[PDB]
Structures are given as structure tokens and as C-alpha cells.
Design a protein around this ligand. Structure first.
Ligand SMILES: O[C@@H]1[C@H](O)[C@H](O)CO[C@H]1O
Ligand SMILES: O[C@@H]1[C@H](O)[C@H](O)CO[C@H]1O
Lengths: 326, 279
């Protein structure tokens, strides 16, 4: 005679979070959970580890990009999975939204226990697809394309951009430019904010057009640097929002017949393997990619085994790598 | 089109864990071809052992993919035990055959590629030409070395002892191999680098040796990864048609899925010299 709606009326919470209290498949406040059970009693209402739908498999949806950062991060995740005795299935995704939704749906149809998302820029793989697999937790890496209640594992890019800029300030540069990633991508915005913070703290003015947007790819770095090279007041130094764009920066400087660091100092972000092979080797901010992968897998596995775990939004501190570019 | 209950319209790909950009670029091409053909692509990284590699393969097979693409850097025989559990599933090998079999192979023509690269240097007037190879157990590396030898023989040019040096088709191998060449008393005028990844290492070595490219030493790579055109100077290299390779590989695999009795395909696409500033 009693339904879940009977329970949720008496309790005064939504039927959807009574279903979460009975299934124990999401985090519910300890308050609410005692009241839902307080209404389950009275109404006498009648409805881990060993699941028919589980496969000991983790899925990961990654962007298609020629930015080595993503491969390096994936490699870290791969290693962590192996070490934890999980198998990892990957799907590249490109193009528009329906393309990206098709790929995600295919991965889910393969019946993974958990999902890692590593997306670029404008990218929303549909909440509608994930809603069709509600028992499957999602952990987002690097940035949250769409927010939500999903766990997030990333570096601290606000601190990162500040470190990079402060480094240049400490080396005596006052005319410091900043090449950003796409500003609708949160890590790019945070790195720009870190740069602004360091400049303000030093009482340094940022000339108009010293902040230039790129695409976090080789080409964006090139286009952005050529723009900066047409500034009447020429920069002494440039914070390039990632190492991929620094590659473009170097190419631009090479064609402009300018030396690094003698004419212009350059500092990147990521510490991709390529950074240490550049000429000169690239001063950059090291993201701990292995630790990020380990942490992401650890969190996802924790949530797989304990659905009620509270949301994790965790930031690892990056480290300046001093080399020859700055 | 077949109506098979046991198919999933999914292609599996077992790929190296290398971050050499070549592999990602090739995967991207395969992905696009799959989409266009209405197939999904699922990937699994594999890294050294013999177990480990078998775990990954077994996971893919347990997902029930219709066909398998192999894109490896490490040699590895599949367990007969696993293959015996999934007899129905055709495999197409991309770039290189890790193990000898009757499986289809879709690759570039690396013998021609290495010859083109070396002949180019010869035509630019270099006589002291070194060759950095990939791993010698890897067929494309051997073929590129043979192409180099062929061009040098045709020109009647002598190859000094130790002018052929092995690397790992990665940044680090290029660096280590070039350092070795830079300890040769008779110093090369030019180096064919085996792939673009190793050319990145070569550049770093030359930079530390305070040598300019091309003024002191000319460099020609192999692959034409995106990075090649951003190098300083931009890298003269041999372009593999990665998109065409991906399309062809998917097309062959789909053909074999629908027609199992199809005869073995061993197909080689001709690569193209990209002239830039390094040579
Ligand atoms: O954190 C990542 C890396 O810096 C990548 O290189 C670009 O996108 C950012 O969000
Ligand atoms: O054909 C491939 C590519 O050249 C890659 O860069 C290294 O491995 C070779 O076999």
C-alpha cells in the first residue's frame, strides 16, 4: 500500500532522492538519510562489490588532439588501471555533439564500471547519455565541461599561472605577455587570472593586447605570437598557456629571427616530454600527470565500491621546471 | 550488409602506449574512417610483458568487437588459448606485422621511403650521410635502412663504420643516436633520422653540440607528423599518408568481416618527400 512517493511526501524530499536513499547509489546528507529512513519506518515500506552489470572495466572518453599532453595523461591512467587490476577501454571523440554522443553511448554499451572524461574546450557529451547509465560514476579530469555533482581531478592552474608569471617577474622582466587557451575552457581562464594576480602584486601594468587567445595547440601559439610581435611595445617575455602553444611561439620567433631567451624569454605549461627537447629546453610548469591519473583512478574505484562517497574536487599543486628558455 | 546477432558494429584497436605523435595521428584517421562507415572504435593500450598484453587483448575480445586492428611497437605472439576462444574475429595489422601470420597488412612503402630520403640528400650534394634506424627487430626500420643502403650503393658512396646507428623511434633514441654519430672523428654532413620523433632528439643533440641545421648538418626525417612543420628549422621529411592508411585498413577489415574467405591483403601506400628547411 506504500510507494516511494508516499515515503517522499511524508519525508518532504523528492522521490528521486528517496530512490537514492534506498539504493545507496549516490551521496545523500546524513541528515536527510535518517529522515527518509524515518519515513520508511512508520509507513512500513517494502521495496556492493558483487553486481551482475559490472565487468572490472573502466571506460575513458578522450579528445582527439595533437597536443601531447593528452597522450601523456592517458598513459598515466593506463598504468594506474593495470596496477589496480582494472582493464581500460578508450574512445577518441571529435567533431560535433551528436558525434560525441554516439561515441559515449557506444562506450557505455560496452558495460564499463566507471567513466573518466578528458574533454577539450567547447565539449558537452550529453548528460542524457550518462542519465541512461545512472549506476555508472563519472570522474572528470582536468576540467568540468558542464559542472554537475561529478568528481573532478585536476591541477591547480590559478596557482600555476601565478608561479609562471612570478618566475618571470623574479628574473627581472616587466613587459610580460600572456597567451591564453580558449577562455571558455576553465584552466585557460584560471591561468590568465594567475598571471593577472602576479602582475598586480608586482604593480606591473598589462598593456592593451598583451593578453592574446590561442587554442592550446601548435597553431594557436604561432598565430598568437605573431600578433604579439606586431605590438609597438614589444614583450620581453611571454607566458604561453601550454607547451603546445610554446612550440608555435618558438616557430614564430624563429621566423622573426629572434633568439630565446636573449631576445624574448618563454615559459610554458604542462611539462610535456617535448619541452625538455626544445632548443632551448623549455622552462614550464609541470603538471604531475602520473599522480593525476593515479588519483583519478583511485577516486573512481572508491566511488565504484562506495557510491555514497561525497563529491571530490581535488587539485594537485604544479611545479616550476627551470630550463633555458627563461 | 549482414544481419548477425553476434556482431556489434564495433572495431577494436590494440595500440602501443608510445607518445610518439605518429600513432595518435594515425588513430585519429582510423577513428574518422570508422565514423564515416558507421562503426564505433574501441581502443586498448598495451605495454611490455606478454601477460599484460594478453589481458588487454582478452578484454577487447570480451567486449565482442567485429574486427581487430593492431598498431604495435613491441613484438608479441598472441596466446593460442585466447585465439582458440575467439576464432571468428579477423585481425588487420597496421604499419608492421608484430608476428608472422596470414593476417592482412596495411602500411606505407618504407623501402622506397628510405631511398627517397637518402637520394634527396645525395642530390643536395652530401656524401657523408648517416642513418639513424628504428629498432632492428622492427620491419619498417630495417626497410628504411635498406632503402638508404640502396641509394648509397647506386651513388657509389661509401658508408663509414658506425654511420648506421640504432635508435628506438622516440625522442630519446634520436638524441642518444646523434650523440654517438657526433663522436665519430669523420663527422657526417647529413643524417637520415628514421622517424620525426628521433629527429626531435637529433635537433636537441645538435643544439648542444653547437651545430646549426642545415648549415652544419642537414636532417631529413620520416612520417611528417604535425610537429615537423613547426620545428626550427621546419623538418624535411617523408610524408606517410596516415588518413589513407586508416581508411584502407578499415575498408579491408570491413571487407574481411563481411567476406571471411577473402584472400590476404598486403598493401603498401607510396610516401612523399616534403621539402622544408632542414635539408
Ligand atoms: O590542463 C590542460 C593542459 O594544459 C593542456 O595542454 C591544455 O588544456 C588544459 O586544460
Ligand atoms: O611507420 C612507423 C612510424 O614511422 C613511426 O614513427 C615509428 O614506427 C614506424 O614503424
Amino acid at each position: 500500500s506504500a510507494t516511494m512517493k508516499d515515503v517522499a511526501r511524508l519525508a518532504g524530499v523528492s522521490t528521486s532522492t528517496v530512490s537514492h536513499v534506498i539504493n545507496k547509489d549516490r551521496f545523500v546528507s546524513e541528515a536527510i538519510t535518517a529522515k527518509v529512513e524515518a519515513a520508511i519506518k512508520e509507513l512500513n515500506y517494502a521495496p556492493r562489490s558483487l553486481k551482475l552489470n559490472q565487468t572490472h572495466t573502466i571506460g575513458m572518453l578522450i579528445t582527439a588532439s595533437t597536443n601531447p599532453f593528452y597522450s601523456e595523461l592517458v598513459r598515466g591512467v593506463e598504468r594506474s588501471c593495470f596496477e589496480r587490476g582494472y582493464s581500460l577501454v578508450l574512445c577518441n571523440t571529435e567533431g560535433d555533439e551528436q558525434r560525441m554522443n554516439r561515441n559515449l553511448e557506444t562506450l557505455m554499451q560496452k558495460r564499463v564500471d566507471g567513466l573518466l572524461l578528458l574533454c577539450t574546450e567547447t565539449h558537452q557529451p550529453s548528460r542524457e547519455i550518462m542519465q541512461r547509465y545512472p549506476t555508472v560514476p563519472t570522474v572528470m579530469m582536468d576540467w568540468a565541461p558542464f559542472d554537475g555533482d561529478s568528481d573532478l581531478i585536476q591541477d591547480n592552474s590559478l596557482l600555476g599561472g601565478d608561479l609562471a608569471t612570478q618566475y618571470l617577474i623574479d628574473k627581472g622582466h616587466t613587459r610580460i605577455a600572456c597567451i591564453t587557451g580558449p577562455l571558455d575552457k576553465t584552466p585557460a581562464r584560471l591561468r590568465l587570472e594567475g598571471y593577472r594576480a602576479a602582475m598586480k602584486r608586482a604593480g606591473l601594468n598589462i598593456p592593451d593586447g598583451y593578453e592574446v587567445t590561442g587554442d592550446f595547440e601548435f597553431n594557436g601559439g604561432f598565430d598568437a605570437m605573431r600578433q604579439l610581435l606586431s605590438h609597438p611595445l614589444r614583450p620581453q617575455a611571454v607566458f604561453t598557456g601550454n607547451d603546445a602553444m610554446a612550440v608555435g611561439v618558438y616557430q614564430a620567433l624563429y621566423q622573426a629571427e629572434l633568439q630565446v631567451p636573449q631576445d624574448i624569454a618563454v615559459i610554458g605549461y604542462d611539462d610535456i616530454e617535448l619541452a625538455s627537447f626544445m632548443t632551448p629546453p623549455l622552462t614550464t610548469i609541470h603538471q604531475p600527470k602520473d599522480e593525476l591519473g593515479e588519483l583519478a583512478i583511485d577516486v573512481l574505484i572508491h566511488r565504484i565500491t562506495q557510491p555514497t562517497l561525497q563529491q571530490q574536487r581535488l587539485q594537485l599543486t604544479p611545479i616550476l621546471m627551470e630550463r633555458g628558455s627563461a
